[PDB]
Design an enzyme around this catalytic site. Structure first.
Site, PDB file in Angstrom:
ATOM      1  CE  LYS A 145      -4.171   1.806   2.364  1.00 49.55           C
ATOM      2  NZ  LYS A 145      -4.916   1.864   3.368  1.00 49.55           N
ATOM      3  CG  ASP A 151      -8.306   1.570   5.231  1.00 49.69           C
ATOM      4  OD1 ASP A 151      -7.574   2.553   5.032  1.00 49.69           O
ATOM      5  OD2 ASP A 151      -9.385   1.614   4.079  1.00 49.69           O
ATOM      6  CG  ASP A 168     -12.910   3.746   6.492  1.00 51.11           C
ATOM      7  OD1 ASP A 168     -14.244   3.940   6.417  1.00 51.11           O
ATOM      8  OD2 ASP A 168     -12.190   3.499   5.329  1.00 51.11           O
ATOM      9  CG  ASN A 221     -11.452  -0.680   5.706  1.00 57.86           C
ATOM     10  OD1 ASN A 221     -10.759  -0.943   4.640  1.00 57.86           O
ATOM     11  ND2 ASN A 221     -12.032   0.318   5.886  1.00 57.86           N
TER      12      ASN A 221
END
Ligand code: KAN
Ligand code: ADP
Ligand code: MG
Ligand code: MG
EC number: 2.7.1.95
Length: 263
Positions: free
Chosen positions: A43, A207, A189, A194
């Site tokens: 990522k 995340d 989030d 996630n």
């Protein structure tokens, strides 16, 4: 500015067949590394978001801190190459929640999963939590994003119930209705995109750039939001609260839901 990853990291992922994620809606780039003995994940975010809750750099910090406290990926490699923050991590164990129930008569299983995440979150000692995502800090960050045009103000998937006719109306509101805050560990989030599940239990969280200290209602609000859209039935929201064992503070749920609108 070579635009992406350093040589070392290039060598590290060579063995794997790189497959670009298409789910992530953030500004981050996500790649699944299909390997023989396992799968890895890469990522990365560019310099524009350095310092913000989007910065994988920050995401890496929370990933390390949460180790031995929550099911998170293993930090395999991290570097700051060409203005980018790149993270190499282990594949989350389990099955992506969304995928696991993508089409089932399992409303209850979903709600259970959500409530487990919340209780679980509450049991985490934030005394040494690297970051603090209090409303003050968030609004400062929102203000920053809007000023630097880092936020999609025109083409985002807004709630059918967001009043405001423009960004600043909402900012103003959030800045004016700040509710009382009671810090607890916060994912930032919390959604079925996630969260990972296994044998009917949470098995992983990803995340994390937005993780840290924040009010209890933040995550609770996010769950409610998913629930009301993914399982139309006011009755299933009541159940979620039954499982959490608390009454809904609608005023605060609405607030945190709006807070996420511009992110
Ligand atoms: N901008 C980048 C972010 O984009 C999404 O965030 C957006 C939510 O998706 C929207 O909510 C929608 O999706 C929910 C599922 O989460 C549904 O319940 C809800 N009914 C839908 O309106 C919400 N209105 C705005 C929010 N910024 C991603 O989730 C998040 O990871 C990513 O960083
Ligand atoms: N460690 C991981 N294990 C398994 N899937 C992952 C992992 N990291 C990312 N993914 C997958 O990629 C998607 C996007 O990653 P995420 O970190 O959520 O990026 P974004 O911040 O854009 O939502 C996730 O929904 C998940 O499908
Ligand atoms: Mg995600
Ligand atoms: Mg994200």
């Amino acid at each position: 500015a070579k635009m992406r990853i350093s040589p070392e990291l290039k060598k590290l992922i060579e063995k794997y067949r790189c497959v670009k994620d298409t789910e992530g809606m953030s500004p981050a780039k996500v790649y699944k590394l299909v390997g023989e003995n396992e799968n890895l994940y890469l990522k990365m975010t560019d310099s524009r978001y350095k310092g913000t809750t989007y910065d994988v750099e920050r995401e890496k910090d929370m990933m390390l801190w949460l180790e031995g406290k929550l099911p998170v990926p293993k930090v395999l490699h991290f570097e700051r190459h060409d203005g980018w923050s790149n993270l190499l991590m282990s594949e989350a164990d389990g099955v992506l929640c969304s995928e696991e129930y993508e089409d089932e008569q399992s409303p209850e299983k979903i709600i259970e999963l959500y409530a487990e995440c919340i209780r679980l979150f509450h049991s985490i000692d934030i005394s040494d939590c690297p970051y603090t995502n209090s409303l003050d800090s968030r609004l400062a960050e929102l203000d920053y994003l809007l000023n630097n045009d880092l936020a999609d103000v025109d083409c985002e998937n807004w709630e059918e119930d967001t009043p405001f006719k423009d960004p600043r109306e909402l900012y103003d509101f959030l800045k004016t209705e700040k509710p009382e805050e009671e810090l607890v560990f916060s994912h930032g989030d919390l959604g079925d995109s996630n969260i990972f599940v296994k044998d009917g239990k949470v098995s992983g969280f990803i995340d994390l750039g937005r993780s840290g200290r924040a009010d209890k209602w933040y995550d609770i609000a996010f769950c409610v939001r998913s629930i009301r859209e993914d399982i139309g039935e006011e009755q299933y929201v009541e159940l979620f609260f039954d499982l959490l064992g608390i009454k809904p503070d609608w005023e605060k749920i609405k607030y945190y839901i709006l807070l996420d609108e511009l992110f």
